[model samples]
Structure formats: structure tokens, C-alpha cells
Target: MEKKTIVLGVIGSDCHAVGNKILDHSFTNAGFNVVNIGVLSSQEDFINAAIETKADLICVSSLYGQGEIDCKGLREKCDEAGLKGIKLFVGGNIVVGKQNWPDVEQRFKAMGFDRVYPPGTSPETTIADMKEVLGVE
Candidate 1:
């Protein structure tokens, strides 16, 4: 079976590298081709990585509390860049503060994310969901 490629990155000017590393390790162990773009990534950076790697999915991680702003327009940009079929997953301190989960998740869903996780969501849970979405065993 062909391994799925995932472009993982910490979006925006957030310099959080720990989450990116952990996600990289988890997805790699889960049998994915993880292209981790490290910290301080822009939307264009992730889209470029996805295009370069022909990634099946993009996982945007942000912990600096600006995810709602940072992750905006990503799907539209991907489509414009000829990646309309690519899937998106976003998580980690997505909003400013003290917001409800369902509300935040709804906003991300409207922005075209296939999955939205709250802060501290385990990598295993994400991997399980990704496998189900990507139809892998």
C-alpha cells in the first residue's frame, strides 16, 4: 500500500516547535510520510509543501493563541494553488481565549478543515481520525 503524505507545520509567526516535533513523531510512527515544516510557517509555506510532496493532508498546529487569524483563507489558497482535493486538520489553542469548543470547531469547519481539535488533543486520537478519513488501516 502506498503511504499517505502529511504536511505538518506550526502556522503563523508562532515559534512553537515542541508541538510540531511531537506531531511529526506521531504521524511518522503512524506510517505517514510526515513533511514537517517546523515553526513560523505561513499559509503559503504549507501549501507549497503540500504541492511539493503531493500530500494527502495538511495538519496545521498553532499554540500561540492566534490560530483563528493565522489559519484563515488556507483552504481557498490551496484550491487556488491547485490543491483542492487535499484534506486539512487544525488544532491547538485555536482562538483568543475561553471560547467554547463547539463554536470554535464550527468556525474551523466553515473554513474547510476536515477536523478541528481543541488544545491538548492527543496525537493518537488525531491519527485514528486521519486513518478513518484517509481510509487506511
Candidate 2:
């Protein structure tokens, strides 16, 4: 079977690198096509790479805790760029500090993220969700 493509990135100028690199290597090892944009990326970077690779989804990581500002309006932007229906998943310390997870999750969902995971959420869990969401199991 053809590998499904996933565009992975550390969005919004966040310089965090370890998780992004680990996920990149992990997914590639899992037999998926991974287009990993390293640290200091923007929303456009994700979109452009996904388009180029025909990626099924974008897995955005933000460890600097400004993902709200970083991820705002991304769905609309994707739509404008003709990326409507593209799946988006975001994780890490997405907000500035301790906040209610349900509230934070709702905020991201409002912004069109398909899933929002807390810090320390494992890659195995993420892969399982991706497989189910993409019906690849």
C-alpha cells in the first residue's frame, strides 16, 4: 500500500526541535511519508509543504506556549489557500501556562483543530489516533 503523507512542523517561530525531530524519525520508521519542517516554522510553511507532498494532515508542535496566537486562523488560512478539508492536529504546551484542558481544547477546536494533546502526550497514542482518523488500520 502507498504510504500516507503527514506534514509535521514546529509552528510559529518556536525554536523547539527535539520533539519535532523525534516524531519525524518515528513516523518515517512507521512507514508513513513524513515531511518534517524543522524548528521556526509558520502556518504557511506547513500548508505549502503539505500541498507539495499531498499530505493527509498536519501535525503542529508548539512548545514555547503561544500556540493560541500561533495557530489562530490557521484553518481559515488553509481554506483560503485551497486546503479545505485538510486535517490539523496540534500538541505540546500550546498555551502560556496552566489552563483548563477542556477550555483549551475547545478553543483550538473552535479554531478548527481536529485534535489537541497536552504536553507529554505520547507518540504511540498520537499514531493510533491518526490511524483511526485516517482509517488506515
Candidate 3:
């Protein structure tokens, strides 16, 4: 089977890089062709990279509690950018606080995110979900 291409990034003004790097290495080792777009990415950055790489997936990471805001409208943007079929994934401190994870997940799901990871979720779990989502398992 051909390896899946995943565009991974830290979105918006969030400068958190450690988790991003860890995810990049983990996904690479898990057999994905990962495009690590470092920190300070916008929605357009993710869309552009996915389009440029013909990526099968876009994995977004944010740790500065603005992921929900930054990720809003991303699904529509991807569709508008001609990436409607691309798999969308997001994780990492995705909310402003721990008080509304369920609601946050629901909101993101409604926005078309294929998988939304809770804070502190292991990369192994993400890899498993990726394989399942992509029908690699």
C-alpha cells in the first residue's frame, strides 16, 4: 500500500513546539509521510500544505488554548480550497480550559474534524485512529 501523506502543524499564534516535534517523529515512525509545518500556522497554512503535498490527512496541533478559535471554519476552508476529501485531525489543549472538553469535541466534530484528541492523549492512540480512518488497519 502507498504510504499516506499527513500535513502536521502547530496552528495559529501558539508557539508550542515540543508536542509538535514529538508528533512529527511519532507519525513518521508510524509509516506516514509527514510534512511538519512547525509553529505559528494558520488555517491557510494547513490547506496550502495539504494541497501542495497532495496529503491524505491534515493533523493540527495547538497547545496555547486557542485551537478551537483557530480551527473554526477550517473544514469549510478546506472544502473551498478543494481539499474536501482530505482527512482532518486536531489535538492538544484544544480548549481554553478543562471545563468544556465534551462540548469542545462536539463543536469540532460538527465542524468536520475526523478526529479530535483530548489534551494529554498519547500519540499511539492517534496513530491507531489514523490507521483506522485511512483504512490501513
* Number of the top lDDT candidate: 3
C-alpha displacement of 117 in model 3, angstroms? 1.3
Which parts of model 2 are misplaced by more than 4 Å? Answer: 1-3, 11-16, 25-30, 63-70, 93-113
TM-score of each: 0.64, 0.64, 0.65
For residues 1-137, what per-residue lDDT tens digits would candidate 1 score against the true structure? 23467667664554545456466665655577867665545555555665677767656676544444444545565446666423565565445433344564466545544555666668676766466655643
Which candidate wins on TM-score?
Answer: 3
Worst 10 residues of 1 by lDDT: 93-102
Better of 2 and 3 by lDDT: 3
10 residues in a row with least lDDT, candidate 3: 64-73
Candidate 3 residue runs with Cα over 4 Å from true position? 1-3, 11-16, 63-70, 84-86, 96-108
TM-score order of candidates, top first: 3, 1, 2
Clashes found in each candidate (C-alpha, N, C closer than 3 A): 0, 0, 0
Rank candidates by lDDT, best first: 3, 1, 2
- Model 3: what TM-score? 0.65
Q: What CA RMSD would candidate 2 show? A: 4.5
Give residue 3's error in model 2 in angstroms. 7.5
